[PDB]
C-alpha cells in the first residue's frame, strides 16, 4: 500500500510511472530466498483524481506456501506551487493591493500549459472573491476532451500602516 505522487502537470497531460520494486523470491530450488528487482508500469490517465488505486496482483514477497501479497498504489496530488487542485478545477490565488481592489486591476492568470490570460476588473474586488475562467481547469477523466475551470481567488493585501495624513483623507472618501 504505497503513495504514487503525481504533479498537476502530469494529471493534466497524463504520464507513465516506472516504479522498480525489490521483492524476495523463492528460487527454482524450493528452499532458499533471492532478492528480485522488477519495474512496475503505471499509466496515469489525464484528469485522474487522488485516491485512484492501481493494484499489481501478487508482487509482494515470496518464500512460504501461501499467496504473495498484492502491491496497491494510491494516487496522491503533489503540492503545486502555483495552483491548488479542486477536483477537475484548479484554484489560482491572486494577491493584489488594496489600491487595486478598490480602483481597478488586471490579473495575468497563468494557465496549465504555461501561458497567461489577462483578466480585467473594473468593479470593487472583495477579500476572498472568486472569478471563474471557464475551461482552464483539468481534463475530466472519463471525458478528457472536456475540462474543468480555473478559479481566481483574491487575497487583498492591506497597507502595514496608515499615516495620520492618509487617515484624514480616508475618513472623507470611505463610508462610515
Amino acid at each position: 500500500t504505497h503513495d504514487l505522487r503525481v504533479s498537476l502537470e502530469e494529471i493534466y497531460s497524463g504520464c507513465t510511472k516506472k516504479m522498480k520494486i525489490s521483492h524476495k523470491r523463492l528460487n527454482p530450488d524450493g528452499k532458499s530466498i533471492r532478492n528480485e528487482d522488477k519495474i512496475l508500469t503505471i499509466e496515469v490517465k489525464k484528469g485522474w483524481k487522488e485516491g485512484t488505486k492501481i493494484t499489481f496482483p501478487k508482487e509482494g514477497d515470496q518464500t512460504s506456501n501461501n499467496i504473495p501479497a498484492d502491491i496497491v498504489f494510491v494516487l496522491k496530488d503533489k503540492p503545486h506551487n502555483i495552483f491548488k487542485r479542486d477536483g477537475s478545477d484548479v484554484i489560482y490565488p491572486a494577491r493584489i493591493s488594496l489600491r487595486e481592489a478598490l480602483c481597478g486591476c488586471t490579473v495575468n492568470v497563468p494557465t496549465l500549459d504555461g501561458r497567461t490570460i489577462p483578466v480585467v476588473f473594473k468593479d470593487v474586488i472583495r477579500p476572498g472573491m472568486r472569478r471563474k475562467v471557464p475551461g482552464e481547469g483539468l481534463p475530466l477523466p472519463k471525458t478528457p476532451e472536456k475540462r474543468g475551470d480555473l478559479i481566481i481567488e483574491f487575497e487583498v493585501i492591506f497597507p502595514e500602516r496608515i499615516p495620520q495624513t492618509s487617515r484624514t483623507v480616508l475618513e472623507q472618501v470611505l463610508p462610515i
Binding site: K20, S22, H23, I71
Partner: peptide
Amino acid sequence: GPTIEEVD
C-alpha cells in the same frame, strides 16, 4: 513488505 522506488 518489499521496497518500492521510481526509475526510468
